[PDB]
Design a protein around this ligand. Structure first.
Ligand SMILES: O=C(NCc1cccc(OCCSc2nc[nH]n2)c1)c1nc2ccccc2c(=O)[nH]1
Ligand SMILES: [Ca+2]
Ligand SMILES: [Ca+2]
Ligand SMILES: [Ca+2]
Ligand SMILES: [Zn+2]
Ligand SMILES: [Zn+2]
Length: 167
């Protein structure tokens, strides 16, 4: 027999993602680089592996949409809600949605896609919000300006998946 696990987490280390569509704001290459870097934040400190799929069904389906986009979490136009992600699980589980009424960038302007993606993927992997104002998983976006994952987030993700290779 099997009972359901204690926390919401992926039960496998090999995860897939798919970039379903793309924002007008950035080149395809910029978007791809941003997401690749965002996943690397988490794989660098766990045993998790992330592989991109070009089509079909991936664990983490990534898309850009506006207003009603196919779930119970409609977007709201410019500002306000910017993105959301589902905790680990089937179908919707793990998926990450970005509000395409926001301005997404590879800079300090608008919302930096890498930074928001890294936060959202934290949710996709089973982290909720932190109370540490310096954490990646703090609930309020601030662009501070070499990226290092804060210790609070390291401790959080490793509580779920272990450290993988520590060196
Ligand atoms: O801003 C930072 N972290 C918090 C954050 C990020 C993204 C979105 C956020 O909030 C989104 C709205 S809450 C929501 N809505 C739906 N899901 N979750 C909040 C940050 N961390 C860093 C950590 C290390 C180095 C630099 C930085 C840096 O430069 N910035
Ligand atoms: Ca919005
Ligand atoms: Ca999914
Ligand atoms: Ca946009
Ligand atoms: Zn959504
Ligand atoms: Zn969040």
């Amino acid at each position: 027999y099997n009972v359901f696990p204690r926390t919401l987490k992926w039960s496998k280390m090999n995860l897939t993602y798919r970039i379903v569509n793309y924002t007008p704001d950035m080149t395809h290459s910029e978007v791809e680089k941003a997401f690749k870097k965002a996943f690397k934040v988490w794989s660098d400190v766990t045993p998790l592996n992330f592989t991109r799929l070009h089509d079909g069904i991936a664990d983490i389906m990534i898309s850009f949409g506006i207003k009603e986009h196919g779930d119970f979490y409609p977007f709201d136009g410019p500002s306000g809600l910017l993105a959301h992600a589902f905790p680990p699980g089937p179908n919707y589980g793990g998926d990450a949605h970005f509000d395409d009424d926001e301005t997404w960038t590879s800079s300090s302007k608008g919302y930096n896609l890498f930074l928001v993606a890294a936060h959202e993927f934290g949710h996709s992997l089973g982290l909720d919000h932190s109370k540490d104002p310096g954490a990646l998983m703090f609930p309020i976006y601030t662009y501070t300006g070499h990226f290092m994952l804060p210790d609070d987030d390291v401790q959080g993700i490793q509580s779920l998946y272990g450290p993988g290779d520590e060196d």
